[PDB]
Write a protein that binds this ligand. Structure first.
Ligand SMILES: [Mn+2]
Ligand SMILES: [Mn+2]
Lengths: 257, 252
């Protein structure tokens, strides 16, 4: 099939190079459009006030000076003469779990893919301890299997998949599981120290034992050497609360003017 | 009741000062913790690699050099001997509609307060002499209503206000999120030097902003209220994916 590939670490990242090579060996056609450098640390929204620069690296690669949402949007609206069937973002050098997903760069690229009517998948690697080469080939192998399964057995396509792969060899993996998002921000206290000049500074400390990381969550599966799969929303409207708020607003109207 | 106020425009912004004064005149207790500069245009994630600095301006005001999420988090984890009942963010100088909400700085503050177990509301002004007094009058009425009539507290209210006088306002309406940028083509132009540049085109031919949306409400001079998610987990799809994953495993 015809696949598009993007990320948020940059076009020169080793994670995006291995992912692309694995797909071509499977018999797919792959185009790549990625940022010129690491974009993590800035806003994810679209640029509308200024024009955007772009240059070509090779016959299959384009470099873009902007956000990862700009990359996917332009590629499907006239930048190229190419009609893909699916969008894949990755592979990230750091995991994306729990309540950190909403502001993730890797996820943002897949989000823009579904807005235009295409199923999308996000893939991350769970590394630890910041000369050991990461197991990128392991994450790539899991990607080519999910894609081939979506081809024959499609999904309702009103959802995107978030995937996290443990940093080990394939022979040590234990299997696949479907999980939910957990929480961690609640159990993070603050700290107080002094700089070399004697001014008070503040740190955000580590997580405590009272965190939501029990059985059923994505945090629990990755610690037991399992691959996590979590379906997430695409529309932030809570429809199951509309009828109640409407009656709540009716009372507010009569109490005022 | 006790209220915690924050924003993303700045601690010296006129929008946050009027909001705070109106709440105190209503009989509530107010404490302000806001960013030091107009940091509208950066990431909203928590800071973990570097320490954060903070200064106390007066009796009820703190200036923080970090994201609006850093403001709310620190204020509820030991910075203050204060136990608020609700968090309010605003008032923003522009609007927040459609698919611009997910990456909004104003919303990010209200989002963090919910993770710590507190109800939150975001307020924005739809600017096309700003009418901040009109938005402030609408805020105090909603706050007082929440005390007597509580909500399931698994949702956040997103509020937008038209830029007119109170005498011209027509009422309140419950809406849903619309859309405007899912059909904007790519345009090709040249810079004064000869290079090639690309613009993202304006709103396309057919957009999703009809009856019921949040765009349509403010265009006809109404106040929009939209309940939004906090947990991005789609529980209504866990059944199909499970069976789908089983067939994936059974492919050897
Ligand atoms: Mn990254
Ligand atoms: Mn702002």
């Amino acid at each position: 099939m015809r696949v598009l590939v993007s990320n948020d670490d940059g076009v020169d990242a080793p994670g995006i190079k291995i992912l692309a090579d694995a797909l071509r060996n499977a018999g797919h056609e792959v185009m790549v459009v990625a940022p010129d450098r690491d974009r993590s640390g800035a806003s994810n929204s679209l640029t509308l006030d200024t024009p955007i620069r772009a240059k070509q690296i090779d016959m299959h690669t384009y470099s873009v000076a902007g956000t990862p949402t700009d990359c996917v949007h332009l590629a499907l609206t006239g930048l190229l003469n190419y009609d893909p069937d699916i969008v894949v973002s990755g592979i990230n050098n750091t995991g994306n779990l729990g309540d950190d997903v909403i502001y993730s760069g890797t996820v943002s690229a897949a989000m823009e893919g579904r807005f235009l009517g295409l199923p999308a998948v996000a893939v991350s690697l769970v590394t630890l301890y910041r000369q050991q080469a990461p197991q990128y080939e392991t994450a790539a192998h899991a990607a080519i299997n999910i894609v081939a399964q979506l081809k024959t057995d499609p999904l309702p396509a009103d959802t995107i998949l978030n995937v996290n792969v443990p940093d080990v060899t394939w022979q040590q993996m234990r299997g696949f599981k479907v999980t939910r998002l957990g929480n961690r921000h609640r159990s993070a206290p603050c700290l107080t120290q002094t700089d070399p000049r004697g001014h008070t500074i503040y740190w955000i400390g580590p997580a405590g034992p009272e965190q939501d990381a029990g059985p059923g969550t994505d945090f629990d599966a990755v610690r037991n050497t399992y691959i996590s799969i979590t379906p997430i929303h695409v529309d932030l409207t809570r429809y199951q609360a509309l009828e109640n708020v409407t009656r709540w607003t009716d009372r507010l109207t009569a109490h005022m003017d």
